[PDB]
Design an enzyme around this catalytic site. Structure first.
Site, PDB file in Angstrom:
ATOM      1  N   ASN A 185       0.830  -1.200   0.000  1.00  0.00           N
ATOM      2  CA  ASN A 185       0.000   0.000   0.000  1.00  0.00           C
ATOM      3  C   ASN A 185       0.866   1.252   0.000  1.00  0.00           C
ATOM      4  O   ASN A 185       1.418   1.632   1.027  1.00  0.00           O
ATOM      5  CB  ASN A 185      -0.914   0.000   1.228  1.00  0.00           C
ATOM      6  CG  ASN A 185      -1.989   1.067   1.158  1.00  0.00           C
ATOM      7  OD1 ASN A 185      -1.780   2.136   0.591  1.00  0.00           O
ATOM      8  ND2 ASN A 185      -3.151   0.777   1.731  1.00  0.00           N
ATOM      9  N   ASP A 186       0.984   1.897  -1.152  1.00  0.00           N
ATOM     10  CA  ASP A 186       1.863   3.050  -1.278  1.00  0.00           C
ATOM     11  C   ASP A 186       1.417   4.236  -0.435  1.00  0.00           C
ATOM     12  O   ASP A 186       2.224   5.089  -0.100  1.00  0.00           O
ATOM     13  CB  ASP A 186       1.964   3.479  -2.740  1.00  0.00           C
ATOM     14  CG  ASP A 186       2.953   2.641  -3.526  1.00  0.00           C
ATOM     15  OD1 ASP A 186       4.079   2.409  -3.025  1.00  0.00           O
ATOM     16  OD2 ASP A 186       2.600   2.216  -4.648  1.00  0.00           O
TER      17      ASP A 186
END
Ligand code: GLC
Ligand code: GLC
Ligand code: GLC
Ligand code: GLC
Lengths: 822, 822
Positions: A489-490
């Site tokens: 999850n950036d």
């Protein structure tokens, strides 16, 4: 409602109205040359590099969207229209667009005239080719003038749109009305300079006239929909000198009733060796040998028709590796055709160009390379192998790797650098899968450098060891991997602490240290930690393996204790050590990534679907009650309603969008598989159906985006626009959904020592056969399925009942028949 | 032909047709808030930073150009039109647009309805304000619905146009139909996160309805010229959730014949202190206090009218420093109004945004700051002083400076860094001029850091010394300054040697060493070397001065020998010490920069205009025979027809464009002055007339760009488009042309010890008076002029004949009368 229908026999999607909820594109070209092509003929073409080598101009955020493309202006006795409907928007008696594999046709009929255009990029060709067919379908005579239209990009698209002070003055062409096989225009901007390549726009017949200046063709204060030259009925023969260069020819076609005309246009990318650039001594005239050669190659309908059929053969032969036959024709079309097509495209295109991704940035996530490979490795193993070696060579000697990898340059991105601590384990995921698929353990012995440094080369296996050990030495107080800038999850940035608009959420770190941990890397370490242990053990490194198993077991413990919130797994530990993703909090009580990936890895799996005290089941039940909607499962819940400075980008999104309560399709297949793992196939197929193109075709007016391909993001339950998608085509959703339907629902997945035959799809698919070619052999698998929770298949092999779910790899050229009963 | 005419008494340019050769813009706002405004209402607004803080969206390379702006859709009984003519393009019975100082009016009449819009940004206000007047000019009753239209940019324009994957999902608004003083829409994208500011779009009356979603207002597959809501006759009351947010209200106006309606719209930029962002505890509703306060400030026509007149007062009072009265009204309007206006704009805007410069890059050349200052320093001395100190603080301790300076950040640009060896001497040019103008030598004593490093501060004079000594220690084999990456001419890159598209011509250096020299920095060293010597001497540093004079004399020698080709000066010496700009070669035989700047510095000047053996005269005669065209003097000749890898960017341009044979206006005033220096005023005024807006108004269809302001680039004689301009408004051509007409043709230039009165304009201006305010005093200068070559003026001061050309600075509040005879 729908805006077309599937044509399985033709392997096409057919859009019967120009009025879609949003432009629906296709990809053309499979080697070096690509094209974006909408159902309205919009978009563009580029060779290799969609930033530095873009042939044609496309405007994102055009009003209206998709307003420029390859246009054929029909002038019929004064009335000007286009078969693509746009730009002109003339009333069409008939319109149809068919998107197929590496090609598309668009057809428009108005006032007794029908124009059909076949668009496609030919194999072994750096060219977009158009086959046009004009048919007088009236009872009267027709005398038409057709005006072809292309608008050029000045090669570098970032420059072309931002550096007008320089680039309004550099546009140049050459015009060749008497070309060996018809008429052709050459866009040669900067060929005078450092460019050794130009573009060619041509037609296999003699043009009446031409135009290479956009303002003369279209006119001042005119939209493409009102272009002046076609209304005038005659080309202006404009020669471009700066401003905006276009490719345009007028072609005169006279037609008796029922009589038709066929014309062939080529959009080509021609390079020359540095020494061969000029036809003349003065170095003013381009050398057109290679351009003439290409145009000699498509001077006839017969040639064109053959290139087309060959293209059809390429794709026909390519997609023979895995197919399924079922009661369910939507599953079939996804498994056999559209999902596999999409996976090749993600490989060919990476994340460069989309109607949503703007083709300016040339990079692609290191993690994305690896996940993408899992979806196309059954199609192109030798290429896959070459990919695994390319990306692994940029890996730093300490185990970390560049977060972004440039496929064109085969180099890590320096500006962004490293720091994303989930990235490394993804290289193991890529290697393990590639090898299960092919049995080519040789790759592990291949020499690979660290950070592309000559003389630093080590066997590939040692790279996996770096990747494995990186997590071992980078853990937090709870024994969970340090998150670094972000994990998968950036937008989960726990070391960012930013309050300044325009600082990069993923890279900027305003606090130096901390203890931020991630449960998702933890789950990933157990999953790809054990794959690594398997590879070391087979490799003969028993000590390394038992030892890595030891760490994996340690991480398994940590997840089920320090990583467990009671009814689901925590998402992370922050900079100061407080939990993220806990029922104790008000927002973001539960995140999907660690629930799916962790059960994907058997963490918490009890005795059966009936084992409701099993954490894996509690987690999956939590995911169902709090995250799953008719449109898919949302990323976390509740979504963040105020900005959380300690958590980076995730909360900058309004509830229901992207990483904040959006339905991120990429991560839904994680839960789907996790559901087949625990033994609930029906629930697994349910989830899979909620986000799969074939099954969403009916609700196209909600989806908006293409009903034939996966999109990255569907607005979650807390967005007013829930059900609406964005960012179609280029996404890891394709790879992971193929791997989900092919290997876990259908149940046919390669292993090192054989082929697993373990279906888990539920009652809705009572029977099906899978045809797969694995290690040179063909397995025919005939499944009879009650689809009951916790029922696993009994294999009968070649008429003989066997035990367990593994089928031994037969020799190349063999046919094995596998009967399964559930 | 022309497309309007000058209105001197209104201080306006009035464009009488919507059909100009190219959109003609104006600049609004003079402090923090600016607007680009075309004669068709297109362009955009931004606060301070045109990259990170842009309120509204504008598309460069739109088809057609200028297709979006601030629009007021008139629906009159079903017929929808706009007063700006575009986007709709309805037949207008009357159209007129008037561009004035910091404001513009646009007026359209169609079918008995007239709409006049006053656009302006108010003093002390971060807002673009629109005063609308609707007048029923028919004999019948009217009942109208007006739809206002603005399209928002999501603040960061680079992102807004390239990061759709993220930004199609972050669009948010709030709608306030019952606002304290009417109706208002709030665009609050990213206020949820790190932004402490929003935008407001309002009208001082109750709106019938509204719309904040662009796709609902305009409609699918619709251009702005076809927008669906106005055709429907009723607002859709759309609430934006992502995609494209707009500001739009419908207002109902009923009108008896002859009766009119006045409406006021505000486009506002509202910030809040961090602790004051939310009206609510939940932090969901924006705090609108400050937005209401702004709207309370423009709730009436009376208020608006007063803000307007005040704005008129600001500009009226500002341009009181220098004016001229003549036989020639074009000169007058340029000297008094338009040239001075343009110079303020270059100061306020730097090089950030115009219809050619795209507002994405935030930087401006260090050399450009300095040259710009010379043109506005008589207007805003205290600001100028602050500018000189800002830029000088970024200067490196070794004398070099950042080639680009960020005005907003007051920091040099690191990515580009240093290396352009003409940049340093430009800081002396800035200081010397500022001080001659004001007599404020105190600035030389001001503490200034090197590279913004606290504790490194030295007196400003020491910075000039660094700059002076930098050239002394960086010379080549002939004693001429090393060129480095480039000198004033950015496209002259002798240490680049590039063959790879996308390497930066100005920064990338593929060969490490060499001996590349520049005659232009040489000429600049003599010119600004002696100014520095003057400042050191006055300062009491006699030793430093005589010594710097010594170097200056050495450079003078070098230029007239190693720098002289026989009939003109060489342009430079290359990396391997081969001449550039010599008659021995085929192309680029003569370059203009070293001819003008060197004679500007008296190098080669003989006894008089008759001294035809004087190199300065040979050079200037060469410039006339080989470089001067009806449209101005070209940069070099002949232009390069093939790429010269040893010379960087200059030859990448096609003959007649930009730095390769283009007419670079910036450098023409150098020759003009050089002509007044040698004593040929007529030739100097001739050249000046060839490139000056007032004198080119007649040939507007050739010029294309604004006839009221200077443009950077007019296509030279070897371009088919010769006479055509590009890159208008933002250019050093303004500063340098003002300095040329004000100080050298008219002859009124400040010196340290008094005011020179030395006209050199030729026969065509036989008489004129100049009104100048210098050092608190007013000088009235009445010139009688034969304009004869080599005739210089005799001053009579206050009735008493005096000797020489210098007038002693009288005390503040004094009136001096100076009679000049030529
Ligand atoms: O980077 C800015 C420079 O760009 C060059 O391409 C232009 O020729 C020059 O005029 C300008 O100064
Ligand atoms: O944020 C979750 C995902 O977002 C995607 O846009 C990125 O390509 C991928 O690398 C990342 O894992
Ligand atoms: O840098 C690419 C990233 O941009 C972020 O703004 C997006 O939320 C994320 O999905 C994506 O991976
Ligand atoms: O290239 C010649 C000129 O180009 C301009 O664009 C640059 O700002 C200026 O610094 C230079 O003198």
């Amino acid at each position: 409602m729908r805006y077309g229908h599937f044509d399985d026999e033709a392997r096409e999607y057919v859009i019967t109205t120009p009025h879609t909820p949003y432009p629906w594109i296709n990809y053309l070209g499979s080697e070096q040359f690509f094209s974006l092509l909408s159902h309205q003929a919009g978009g563009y073409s580029f060779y290799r590099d969609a930033k530095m080598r873009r042939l044609t101009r496309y405007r994102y955020n055009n009003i209206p969207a998709d307003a420029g493309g390859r246009y054929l202006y029909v002038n019929d006795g004064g009335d000007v229209w286009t078969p693509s409907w746009l730009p002109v928007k003339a009333d069409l008696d008939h319109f149809e667009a068919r998107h197929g594999l590496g090609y598309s046709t668009i057809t428009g009929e108005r006032n007794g005239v029908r124009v059909e255009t076949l668009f496609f990029v030919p194999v072994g060709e750096n060219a977009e080719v158009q086959k046009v067919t004009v048919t007088n379908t009236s009872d009267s005579y027709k005398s038409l003038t057709l005006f072809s239209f292309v608008e050029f990009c000045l090669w570098n698209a970032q420059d072309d749109q931002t550096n007008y002070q320089r680039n309004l003055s550099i546009g140049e062409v050459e015009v060749e009305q008497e070309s060996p096989h018809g008429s052709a225009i050459y866009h040669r901007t900067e060929y005078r300079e450092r460019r050794d390549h130009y573009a060619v726009f041509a037609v296999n017949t003699q043009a009446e006239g031409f135009d290479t200046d956009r303002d003369t063709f279209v006119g001042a204060y005119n939209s493409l929909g009102e272009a002046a030259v076609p209304l005038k009925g005659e080309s202006a023969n404009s020669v471009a000198s700066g401003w905006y260069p276009i490719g345009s020819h007028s072609v005169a076609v006279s037609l008796a009733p029922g009589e038709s005309r066929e014309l062939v246009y080529v959009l080509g990318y021609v390079e020359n060796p540095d020494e061969e650039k000029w036809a003349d001594d003065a170095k003013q005239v381009v050398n057109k040998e290679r351009a003439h050669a290409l145009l000699s190659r498509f001077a006839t309908s017969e040639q064109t028709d053959a290139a087309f059929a060959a293209l059809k053969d390429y794709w026909t032969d390519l997609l023979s590796t895995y197919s399924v036959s079922s009661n369910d024709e939507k599953l079939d079309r996804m498994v056999n055709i559209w999902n596999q097509y999409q996976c090749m495209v993600t490989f060919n295109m990476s994340r460069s160009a989309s109607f949503f991704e703007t083709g300016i940035g040339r990079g692609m996530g290191f993690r994305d390379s690896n996940q993408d490979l899992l979806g196309f490795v059954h199609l192109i193993p030798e290429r896959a192998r070459e990919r695994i070696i390319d990306i692994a060579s940029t890996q730093f000697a300490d185990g970390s790797a560049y977060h972004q990898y440039q496929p064109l340059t085969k180099r890590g991105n320096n500006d962004i650098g490293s720091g994303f601590n989930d990235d490394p384990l993804w290289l193991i995921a890529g290697t393990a899968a590639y090898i299960k698929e092919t049995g080519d353990f040789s790759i592990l012995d291949e020499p690979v450098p660290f950070d592309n440094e000559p003389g630093s080369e080590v066997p590939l296996f040692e790279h996996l060891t770096r990747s494995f050990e990186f997590t071992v030495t980078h853990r937090g107080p709870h024994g969970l991997p340090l998150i670094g800038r972000a994990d998968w999850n950036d937008c989960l940035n726990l070391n960012c602490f930013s309050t300044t608009p325009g600082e990069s959420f993923q890279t900027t770190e305003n606090q130096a240290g901390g203890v931020a941990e991630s449960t998702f890397i933890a789950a990933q370490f157990v999953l790809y930690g054990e794959q690594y242990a398997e590879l070391a053990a087979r490799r003969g490194l028993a000590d390394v393996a038992d030892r890595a198993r030891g760490h994996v077991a340690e991480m398994r413990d940590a997840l089920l204790t320090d990583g467990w919130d009671g009814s689901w797994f925590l998402r992370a530990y922050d900079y100061y050590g407080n939990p993220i993703g806990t029922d104790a909090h008000d927002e973001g009580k539960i995140w999907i990534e660690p629930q799916g990936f962790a059960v994907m890895a058997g963490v918490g799996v009890g005795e059966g679907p009936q084992d409701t005290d099993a954490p894996a089941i509690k987690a999956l039940d939590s995911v169902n009650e709090m995250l799953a909607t008719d449109h898919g499962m949302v990323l976390q819940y509740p979504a963040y309603t105020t900005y959380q400075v300690h958590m980076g980008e995730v909360s900058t999104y309004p509830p229901g969008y992207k990483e904040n309560g959006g339905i991120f399709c990429h991560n839904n297949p994680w839960v789907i598989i996790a559901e087949t793992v625990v033994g609930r196939g029906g629930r697994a197929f349910d989830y899979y159906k909620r986000i799969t193109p074939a099954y969403r075709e009916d609700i196209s007016d909600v989806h908006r985006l293409e009903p034939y391909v996966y999109a990255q993001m569907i607005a979650g339950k807390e967005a007013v626009r829930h059900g609406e998608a964005k960012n179609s085509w280029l996404t890891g959703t394709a790879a992971w959904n193929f791997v989900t339907v092919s290997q876990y629902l259908l149940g046919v997945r390669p292993e090192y020592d054989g082929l697993v035959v373990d279906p888990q799809i539920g009652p809705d698919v009572p029977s099906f056969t899978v045809t797969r070619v694995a290690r040179g052999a063909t397995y025919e698998i005939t499944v009879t399925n009650s689809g009951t929770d916790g029922s696993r298949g009994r294999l009968v092999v070649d008429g003989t009942p066997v035990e367990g779910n593994l089928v031994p790899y037969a020799p190349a050229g063999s046919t094995v028949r596998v009967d399964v009963t559930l």
